[PDB]
Design a protein around this ligand. Sequence first.
Ligand SMILES: CC(C)(C)OC(=O)N1CCC2(CC1)C[C@@H]2CNC(=O)N1Cc2ccncc2C1
Ligand SMILES: CC(C)(C)OC(=O)N1CCC2(CC1)C[C@@H]2CNC(=O)N1Cc2ccncc2C1
Lengths: 470, 470
Amino acid sequence: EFNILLATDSYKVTHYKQYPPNTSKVYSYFECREKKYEETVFYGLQYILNKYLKGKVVTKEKIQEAKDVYKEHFQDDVFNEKGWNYILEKYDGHLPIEIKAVPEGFVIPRGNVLFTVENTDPECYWLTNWIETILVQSWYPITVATNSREQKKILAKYLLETSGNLDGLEYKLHDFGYRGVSSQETAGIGASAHLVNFKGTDTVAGLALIKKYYGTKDPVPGYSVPAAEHSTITAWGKDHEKDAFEHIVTQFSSVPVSVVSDSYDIYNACEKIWGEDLRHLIVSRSTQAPLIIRPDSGNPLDTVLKVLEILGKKFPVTENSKGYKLLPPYLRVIQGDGVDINTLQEIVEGMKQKMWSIENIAFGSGGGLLQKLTRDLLNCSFKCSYVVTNGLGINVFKDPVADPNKRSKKGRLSLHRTPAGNFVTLEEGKGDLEEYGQDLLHTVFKNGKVTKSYSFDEIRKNAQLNIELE
Amino acid sequence: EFNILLATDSYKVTHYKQYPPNTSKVYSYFECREKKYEETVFYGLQYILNKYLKGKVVTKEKIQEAKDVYKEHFQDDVFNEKGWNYILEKYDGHLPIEIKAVPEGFVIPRGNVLFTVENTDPECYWLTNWIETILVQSWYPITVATNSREQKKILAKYLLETSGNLDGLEYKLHDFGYRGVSSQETAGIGASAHLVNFKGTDTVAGLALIKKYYGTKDPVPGYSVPAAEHSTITAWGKDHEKDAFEHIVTQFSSVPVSVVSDSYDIYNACEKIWGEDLRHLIVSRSTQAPLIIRPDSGNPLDTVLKVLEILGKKFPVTENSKGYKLLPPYLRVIQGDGVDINTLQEIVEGMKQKMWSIENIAFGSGGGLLQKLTRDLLNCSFKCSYVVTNGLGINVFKDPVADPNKRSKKGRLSLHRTPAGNFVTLEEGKGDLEEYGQDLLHTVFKNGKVTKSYSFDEIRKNAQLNIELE
Ligand SMILES: CC(C)(C)OC(=O)N1CCC2(CC1)C[C@@H]2CNC(=O)N1Cc2ccncc2C1
Ligand SMILES: CC(C)(C)OC(=O)N1CCC2(CC1)C[C@@H]2CNC(=O)N1Cc2ccncc2C1
């Protein structure tokens, strides 16, 4: 059993004794604080609301367990038993909290309010920041979705330049990250975030998360194809790599198949094994079932270029209408080693310079896609901006002398469209003046109930690229 | 409800069709591959074995669900229903797998076998690498434990040099990482890995994980103390920072209390508020209840040094027997911003150069400790080294021409003590020659049962620093 009373930073257990006396309201907000990643995809809050925050989340037993744990953990009795019992007795253990959020999938520039949190009962002023820790973990799906989207921009730019269109863009960056993340839960969350932008994944955990918490009209939100790993090649023995390749492409003769080719010598594999010995098994394949050759080692750019050079001399290459070289439709390449947002850019630019179409290549990314990301990439942060004490509201904030970048916003916040159609966050309750049209934040959680939800289809629509919007 | 049939990389669903015909055995191993991190702490496999791998992990319902999901995911019927049904019918859904591993908490040089996996039924040759994905996630607790231990070495060195002993070392690096990790599950796993080396944590999730899967003689494996956050200071209003400080130290007058002091001006807070206005409330405190001043912004080293210099002029400083400056026992500092293994080193060395004892300071680390780590840091990797096909065992491996660092080991593996008492991994079944004594790996999992396990107390003992043992 998950216990929300045990799902906070230890020090937050002690904060109910630290706020000003006679405080009836604590109001806090989340932003991806300003100073590359100029705009962020808001995604993942709905998962947290449903899995952890909604319904009866307080019980007699959970309160007693927290009491027992904290007694030993602090070697002291500090723990707001009275405060938690109040929620249990008054609200049947539902959290007296209201959360307002920008719609999921929305693409918002840095430094804007993305969601706000406040208590709905004066007794529970302490609860707003109790749940900071769990809500701030939304940094992860936001960051995966954003970084995945930025890679989609790079791919779109180069695919368009080298081919004249964006056909198949949504399968150009595949999630290989299941083994390389920190947990099963992280795998599902991160994979789901990547699927906001693409349709290809091997991180199966993402599928069930989307089905349970978001939903799609299609049976599944992500797809894959058969592929070898080094074990299915090397098991045949060093002298039998050709036998492995032949067996595998024949087993998967009528679907696309990726075959890792660098077990011993990627260049030999391309030029002699695929390019000569087994060439007859390749050139006979359907356009709907290409062989996808997979290098997996060496300098990513150098290796991709050398593989393409080798294949271009063993297979019939055409020149497309943009002037770029194109392998025959039954043959493609996938680079799935060392791919991150930086190396992706390097590879596609290198290909373009050597006159190879991005049509020729797909990418897989594991650690770079799902694990090599932190909360400080987008400066995802939760801060109190407004309190009511003795019936008077005051606008509060931090502003550390040595770091203006950590200054936080003041007062009650709202998010608005500007006259030019951009975004602006209004501070100090100025949204109440109604000079800027409707607040784009919507109540998504109130008093233990999820009040507004988005489908995965809606999220995908909101997160589209401008070029996709033609 | 976790389903092991949906907890693998998609392509592994297709591998049972790719191995050589009549393969009865696939044998694989995990290492932290050689190229500072020269030695790794082996920790976390026991969690995976118990939570995910043991007992009846296959049911009719789980098979049908996987079948239904993969049909859509692959747009084809590639799923091995028969193979999974065999496990259900023959072994009541228990995995016919044997896993041997080095004891948890063991500190082992890079490039050694840490665990091995093989099928115990010839029909389940495909099962060995099915579970690669889930087992490889052990990289995370291994890496957190290892990186946390490397930071303990730094702290030990400087604490010993500046004070003459290691008293309180186990509380010098505190886990602040709960909000900065990618999920609740990751938080618990990561926190538990840090607790292999230290006793201080705010990531409460780590406590219940340890209790459930490992166990300690003590009631809890980790501890904390009351502390403020920016919201409990700023809520008082910008003109009332002093009132906030006074309220908090008075509420927590007889236990240690950390109070964040950089909301507006860290240097003013130290020199004028703590150092003058509230000095009388500080010098009266017990040595068991110090005020711990917490800066949280600016250059970490520069800020710590300036804070110490300020405090040194407002409070009575002594010189310890090693010649280093020491704040009075009722006053300490905690630096919890921007701390990672690199900045930790820079701060303690800078303090040493300015003649400040490491006794004066403790560290908190969040993102650096639990999130800013990837599988490539220690090159944690799972590879097939031995197969049996047509009754003949063959030693198998990869050895990519362009990257000798990715070469894998050959044949049946074992771990041994050398004549000088170091570790060596024997390949090609050479352990059977008995020239190197007994295999140090133990069977930890066999046919659905955990066969050997370790308490958290034993893991801690195994992971001790030499300087602690000495
Ligand atoms: C056919 C079409 C053009 C629509 O799509 C593609 O051509 N793609 C290129 C090939 C593709 C699908 C997209 C990526 C997957 C093949 N999988 C693969 O190579 N894997 C899986 C995996 C998981 C973890 N680690 C290592 C690997 C190696
Ligand atoms: C008294 C003794 C000498 C034994 O130990 C210390 O002096 N310590 C320094 C103070 C200590 C305990 C060890 C760390 C905790 C105070 N907690 C704290 O500042 N937090 C918690 C937190 C969690 C997430 N993010 C930000 C923070 C800010």
